[PDB]
Design an enzyme around this catalytic site. Structure first.
Site, PDB file in Angstrom:
ATOM      1  N   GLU A  11      22.002 118.274 -39.836  1.00 57.00           N
ATOM      2  CA  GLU A  11      20.849 117.372 -39.790  1.00 57.00           C
ATOM      3  C   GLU A  11      19.530 118.150 -39.751  1.00 57.00           C
ATOM      4  OE1 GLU A  11      23.756 117.094 -38.191  1.00 57.00           O
ATOM      5  OE2 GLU A  11      23.999 115.154 -37.205  1.00 57.00           O
ATOM      6  N   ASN A  12      19.589 119.395 -39.284  1.00 55.32           N
ATOM      7  CA  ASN A  12      18.386 120.224 -39.128  1.00 55.32           C
ATOM      8  C   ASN A  12      18.275 121.341 -40.161  1.00 55.32           C
ATOM      9  OD1 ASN A  12      17.594 118.741 -36.896  1.00 55.32           O
ATOM     10  ND2 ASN A  12      18.292 120.236 -35.373  1.00 55.32           N
ATOM     11  N   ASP A  20      13.321 122.090 -36.933  1.00 57.12           N
ATOM     12  CA  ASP A  20      13.501 121.616 -35.557  1.00 57.12           C
ATOM     13  C   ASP A  20      13.649 122.739 -34.548  1.00 57.12           C
ATOM     14  OD1 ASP A  20      15.185 118.750 -33.975  1.00 57.12           O
ATOM     15  OD2 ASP A  20      13.696 120.176 -33.252  1.00 57.12           O
ATOM     16  N   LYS A  34      22.612 122.411 -36.825  1.00 56.19           N
ATOM     17  CA  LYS A  34      23.499 121.354 -37.313  1.00 56.19           C
ATOM     18  C   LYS A  34      23.035 120.974 -38.707  1.00 56.19           C
ATOM     19  CE  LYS A  34      20.818 117.924 -34.630  1.00 56.19           C
ATOM     20  NZ  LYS A  34      20.864 116.944 -33.506  1.00 56.19           N
ATOM     21  N   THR A  78      23.434 119.475 -29.335  1.00 58.49           N
ATOM     22  CA  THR A  78      24.179 118.338 -29.857  1.00 58.49           C
ATOM     23  C   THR A  78      25.651 118.538 -29.485  1.00 58.49           C
ATOM     24  OG1 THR A  78      22.579 118.147 -31.625  1.00 58.49           O
ATOM     25  CG2 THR A  78      24.649 116.978 -31.939  1.00 58.49           C
ATOM     26  N   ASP A  97      19.786 124.547 -31.709  1.00 53.38           N
ATOM     27  CA  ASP A  97      20.073 123.239 -32.311  1.00 53.38           C
ATOM     28  C   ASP A  97      20.467 123.262 -33.778  1.00 53.38           C
ATOM     29  OD1 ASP A  97      20.665 120.512 -31.717  1.00 53.38           O
ATOM     30  OD2 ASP A  97      18.638 119.945 -32.374  1.00 53.38           O
TER      31      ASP A  97
HETATM   32  N1  LIG Z   1      15.237 116.576 -35.596  1.00 55.11           N
HETATM   33  C1  LIG Z   1      14.178 115.960 -36.338  1.00 55.11           C
HETATM   34  C2  LIG Z   1      13.435 117.016 -37.077  1.00 55.11           C
HETATM   35  O1  LIG Z   1      13.030 118.048 -36.552  1.00 55.11           O
HETATM   36  N2  LIG Z   1      13.178 116.779 -38.436  1.00 55.11           N
HETATM   37  N3  LIG Z   1      12.491 117.697 -39.134  1.00 55.11           N
HETATM   38  C3  LIG Z   1      12.342 117.281 -40.327  1.00 55.11           C
HETATM   39  C4  LIG Z   1      11.649 118.028 -41.386  1.00 55.11           C
HETATM   40  C5  LIG Z   1      10.829 119.142 -41.209  1.00 55.11           C
HETATM   41  C6  LIG Z   1      10.243 119.713 -42.350  1.00 55.11           C
HETATM   42  C7  LIG Z   1      10.504 119.150 -43.604  1.00 55.11           C
HETATM   43  O2  LIG Z   1       9.982 119.634 -44.783  1.00 55.11           O
HETATM   44  C8  LIG Z   1      11.319 118.057 -43.699  1.00 55.11           C
HETATM   45 BR1  LIG Z   1      11.696 117.248 -45.396  1.00 55.11          BR
HETATM   46  C9  LIG Z   1      11.900 117.486 -42.609  1.00 55.11           C
HETATM   47  C10 LIG Z   1      13.189 115.266 -35.458  1.00 55.11           C
HETATM   48  C11 LIG Z   1      12.872 115.782 -34.219  1.00 55.11           C
HETATM   49  C12 LIG Z   1      11.948 115.128 -33.412  1.00 55.11           C
HETATM   50  C13 LIG Z   1      11.332 113.968 -33.853  1.00 55.11           C
HETATM   51  C14 LIG Z   1      11.650 113.453 -35.096  1.00 55.11           C
HETATM   52  C15 LIG Z   1      12.575 114.099 -35.901  1.00 55.11           C
END
Ligand SMILES: N[C@H](C(=O)N/N=C/c1ccc(O)c(Br)c1)c1ccccc1
Lengths: 336, 19
Positions: free
Chosen positions: A156-157, A170, A154, A187, A152
Site C-alpha cells: 500500500e506504501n 509514508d 507494505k 501493520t 511501514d
Molecule cells: N499511507 C498513506 C500515504 O502515505 N499515502 N501516500 C500516498 C502518496 C504519496 C506520494 C504520491 O505521489 C502518491 Br500517488 C501517493 C496515508 C497516510 C496518512 C494519511 C493519508 C494517507
C-alpha cells in the site's frame, strides 16, 4: 558504496539539523482528486498554479493527529522526509501548515500503488518480485546508514513510477534512533515478532518486513494472515512459515533467513550486514549498481494516458477541505 | 487452497496501520 553513503550522510545531517519549513501555501495549488486516505488525513492530486506541475498533497488534520497521539511521529515524518534523497524515495517538494492542517506536497507517482497491481494480477513472478525487492534492499541500506528505521513497508506504501521503478512513501513511522526503540506501530501482517512481544527492537524489523513483502509479492498473499489482528500476531510469534509449492528453493532459503525469529540469525542484522542479502543466491542475477542507476528494464510499465491522469488509482469519496478561522494545536506543531 | 482462504478473508483490502 561506503564512500557514497558517507557523502549521503553528510547531506542528510545538514538538512536534519536545519529542516526546511513553510515553503509554500495552500492557494498555490489547485485540488484535483483524492488519491488515498488514512486515519488522520488524505492524499490529493493537486496542480501547482505557477508551474502546472502535478503533486501529491498529504493533508493531515492537526486535531486528529493529537487525538491519535501521533504528534511526535508526524514531526518525525516531516523532519526525516525533507532531509533524505534516494532514487526510490518519494521526494517532498514543499511543506506548510494552516489553522487546521499540516500539508506535505510530494512528487506525484502516476503508476499507482503496488497494492493495486498485486491484488489485480494475483501475484508477481520471481524475477518481477526480485526487481522490486532489490530496490527496497538498497533503500533500506540507505535509510539504515542514516540511523533511520522505516517501519511501514507494505504494498500500500509503494508506488510504481512511469518507468516501472518503485517509489517508497509514508514516513509516518520513520524514526532516527541509534539504540533500540519500543513503539508498537506498523501493520499487523508486517510486524516482526520482537515488536509484538514488546522486547524493544531495532532496524532488523525492517528486514523481517522485507521478508513479508517478498513473500506477499511472490505468493499473492502474506505469510501470516487471519481475519483478526490478534490471530495474525499468534501466527507471527509461532513463526512457522509455509511456502507455496511454486516458490523456488533459493526464494525459500532467503525467506527463512529474513523471516527469522532469532535475531542472531536474521539476514540484514549480522556481521556482513546487507551483504548477506545482496549476495544471496536468489539475487544472483541482480546487478545492484544497474538497479540503483535505473538502467535495468522494468518487468512492468504502468499505462499512462496523459499528465495528471489518475486511472491507476481507486476512487474515494471527495470531502471539503475546511480551514478553521482559529488556530488549532499551534504549540504541538510549532516545529512543523 | 491458501489463496482461496486469503481471498475469502476480511483482509484483502488496504490494511490500516496500528497506532
Ligand atoms: N499511507 C498513506 C500515504 O502515505 N499515502 N501516500 C500516498 C502518496 C504519496 C506520494 C504520491 O505521489 C502518491 Br500517488 C501517493 C496515508 C497516510 C496518512 C494519511 C493519508 C494517507
Amino acid at each position: 558504496v561506503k564512500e557514497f553513503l558517507a557523502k549521503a550522510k553528510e547531506d542528510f545531517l545538514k538538512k536534519w539539523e536545519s529542516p526546511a519549513q513553510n515553503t509554500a501555501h495552500l492557494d498555490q495549488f489547485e485540488r484535483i482528486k483524492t488519491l488515498g486516505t488514512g486515519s488522520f488525513g488524505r492524499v490529493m492530486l493537486v496542480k501547482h498554479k505557477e508551474t502546472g506541475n502535478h503533486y501529491a498533497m498529504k493533508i493531515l488534520d492537526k486535531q486528529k493527529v493529537v487525538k491519535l497521539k501521533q504528534i511526535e511521529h508526524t514531526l518525525n515524518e516531516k523532519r526525516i522526509l525533507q532531509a533524505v534523497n534516494f532514487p526510490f524515495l518519494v521526494k517532498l517538494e514543499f511543506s506548510f501548515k494552516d489553522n487546521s492542517n499540516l500539508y506535505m506536497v510530494m512528487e506525484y507517482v502516476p503508476g499507482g500503488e503496488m497494492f493495486s497491481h498485486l491484488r489485480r494480477i494475483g501475484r508477481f513472478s520471481e524475477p518481477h518480485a526480485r526487481f522490486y525487492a532489490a530496490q527496497i534492499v538498497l533503500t533500506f541500506e540507505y535509510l539504515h546508514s542514516l540511523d533511520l528505521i522505516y517501519r511501514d513497508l507494505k504494498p500500500e506504501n509503494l508506488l510504481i513510477d512511469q518507468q516501472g521503478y518503485i517509489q517508497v512513501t509514508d514516513f509516518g513511522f520513520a524514526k532516527r534512533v541509534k539504540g533500540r526503540t519500543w513503539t508498537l506501530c506498523g501493520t499487523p501482517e508486517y510486524l516482526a515478532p520482537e515488536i509484538i512481544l514488546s522486547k524493544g527492537y531495532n532496524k532488523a524489523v525492517d528486514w523481517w518486513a522485507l521478508g513479508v513483502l517478498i513473500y506477499e509479492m511472490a505468493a499473492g498473499y502474506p505469510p501470516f494472515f487471519a481475519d483478526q489482528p490478534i490471530q495474525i500476531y499468534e501466527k507471527i510469534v509461532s513463526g512457522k512459515v509455509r511456502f507455496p509449492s511454486h516458490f523456488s528453493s533459493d526464494l525459500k532459503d532467503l525467506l527463512r533467513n529474513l523471516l527469522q525469529v532469532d535475531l542472531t540469525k536474521r539476514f540484514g542484522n549480522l556481521k556482513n550486514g546487507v551483504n548477506d542479502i545482496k549476495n544471496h543466491k536468489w539475487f544472483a542475477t541482480t546487478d545492484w549498481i544497474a538497479i540503483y542507476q535505473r538502467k535495468v528494464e522494468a518487468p512492468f510499465i504502468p499505462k499512462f494516458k496523459g499528465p495528471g491522469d489518475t486511472s491507476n488509482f481507486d476512487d474515494y469519496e471527495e470531502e471539503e477541505i475546511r480551514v478553521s478561522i482559529n488556530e488549532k494545536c499551534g504549540k504541538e506543531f510549532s516545529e512543523f | 487452497t491458501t489463496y482461496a482462504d486469503f481471498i475469502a478473508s476480511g483482509r484483502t483490502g488496504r490494511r490500516n496501520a496500528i497506532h
